[PDB]
Amino acid sequence: NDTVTIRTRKFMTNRLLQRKQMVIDVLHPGKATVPKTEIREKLAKMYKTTPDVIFVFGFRTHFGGGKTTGFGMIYDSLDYAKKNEPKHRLARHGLYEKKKTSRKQRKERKNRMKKVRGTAKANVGAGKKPK
Amino acid sequence: GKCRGLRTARKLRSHRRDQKWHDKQYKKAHLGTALKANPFGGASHAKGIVLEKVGVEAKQPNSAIRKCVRVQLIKNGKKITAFVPNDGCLNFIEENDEVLVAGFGRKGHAVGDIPGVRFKVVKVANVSLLALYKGKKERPR
């Protein structure tokens, strides 16, 4: 709100990706690191689009406040925002939930399905009732 | 003096690779029998148990009873002597400990006035011989 400047540079739009990708430098002079969810609407109210397809990350504040810099980007659709995007920044604000197993589980589950041959009723069912 | 000439480098090289066998601190680094000879065996430290406390005598201008032990190494097992180098520090090495014998100032030779010693004693029973003289540790149970 109060005393915050938003600037950006190296704007390259492209339609290989159908995004708009640029380097953003956020000026907070004596204040803390701004929330990213506040940044991803302060471009939407500049690019005349909704705060739904503007994604930012990667802010490392420079030494002693002032100009932090980072990345930000703008897609052309929310449906483009689910095609060409790695799933982790798709999930920092909820658009694709992620609760899977740890890899310690998933490996040893496959290590015990590996011994059992052919039984489609007992490849998956290789001890799902005991746990 | 020297044969010289542009084409005689075979003579000037098979004259140097055998006149190099006549200075010592090369010769105890490449001839091999002086590599097996030292008890540490190309190393810097060794552990070993204490077999006997002895008091050797000082050399010709001095007169003192220098204190030594009789470490026997567990690596390449063989008898050596070793020096316990401080004032109130005979008492901190006791019988059949495990001590870490180190070299003694001059590489391979005795210093000063101890005739017939080669190694010194640090780290009696996992604690440093400085760290028992200086009141920082004890001899653990």
Add this chain to the structure above:
Amino acid sequence: VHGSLARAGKVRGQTPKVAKQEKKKKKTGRAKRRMQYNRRFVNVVPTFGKKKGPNAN
């Protein structure tokens, strides 16, 4: 006599023990180099004498 194995650990084993009394700490770090440049060079005193050194007694 000449002390075969007895009186080993003798001269420290009978010394009079004097307590290390407390002092001010030394001005460590950068300020040591401040105060000892000040000890040596900012006051080049005209005391002569073939320049008796820095531990005069």
Add this chain to the structure above:
Amino acid sequence: PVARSWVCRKTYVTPRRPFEKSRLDQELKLIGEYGLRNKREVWRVKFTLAKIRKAARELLTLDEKDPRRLFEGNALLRRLVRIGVLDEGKMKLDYILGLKIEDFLERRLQTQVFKLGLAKSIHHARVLIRQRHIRVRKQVVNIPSFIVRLDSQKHIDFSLRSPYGGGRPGRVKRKNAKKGQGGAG
């Protein structure tokens, strides 16, 4: 097997012989009159001084009319002209050889915050840098060894977040005013 850089060299140098009385004395008054912390960062800038002379005398053993020092010595000089140890219009590869380490301890950050009238008492001019009170034009830097350039030399200033250039007094003023109103309403 790794994605690491590996590359490092030592920056200071240790002397040939120690314990000669005409070395530590003529080096002590560097450590005190220019206000440093230990003698390793005197040897640091002197070894920096040393190879430039070793560079320039690899260059002075060349003659006239060969292209390499034309690239090297000119690029040498357009880097230490801009640091301010050696002025511009008299650019030669020969004035550089008669140059002394008193000028490299003159172009620091730390002695220029003493002689631009920003402070007092050269050791104190160390203190203000490291205690986060001094900015370059937009950049606040707590480094005394910042050999600040000739170009950005008129631009050292107190920070906007400094006491001496801004506000919110820190913990000594806040503590004293609190207890006086901490006996009644």
Add this chain to the structure above:
RNA sequence: GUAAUUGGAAUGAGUCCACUUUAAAUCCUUCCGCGAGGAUCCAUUGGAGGGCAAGUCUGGUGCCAGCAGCCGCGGUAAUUCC
């Protein structure tokens, strides 16, 4: 420079959000707050005869204990031993 009296738009370690980084977190970077008077919130390692910068100051020992890389100091006043 002691021995001081204070201080104040001085601050870092330390404890503390919160943002940030990151795949998820951690440092670190930023930033409420608390956080220095023997600023007890404390700097050691080795030496002080000569090579080699630095002591014939004090006490103890008495060729003993021990030091010392080399020369050497050690036998009742030690510039080297504790």
Add this chain to the structure above:
RNA sequence: ACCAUGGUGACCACGGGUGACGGGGAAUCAGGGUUCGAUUCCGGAGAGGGAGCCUGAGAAACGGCUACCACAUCCAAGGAAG
């Protein structure tokens, strides 16, 4: 397989050692060198020891098998797995 009596050597063959993997390079430097390099890059080799193989385009592969020798595991001692 039938013939011929040749080949190598003091310009160091052949045999022995190597606390020898080779090379890019590293430490050091007036010039000249002395030492190091198992080590992330490239090239060699081998998966306890030696041998033999199938499949595949490419393996004499060993996170493929079979045998022996050295080491070791389960067993209801009938046999299984390295």
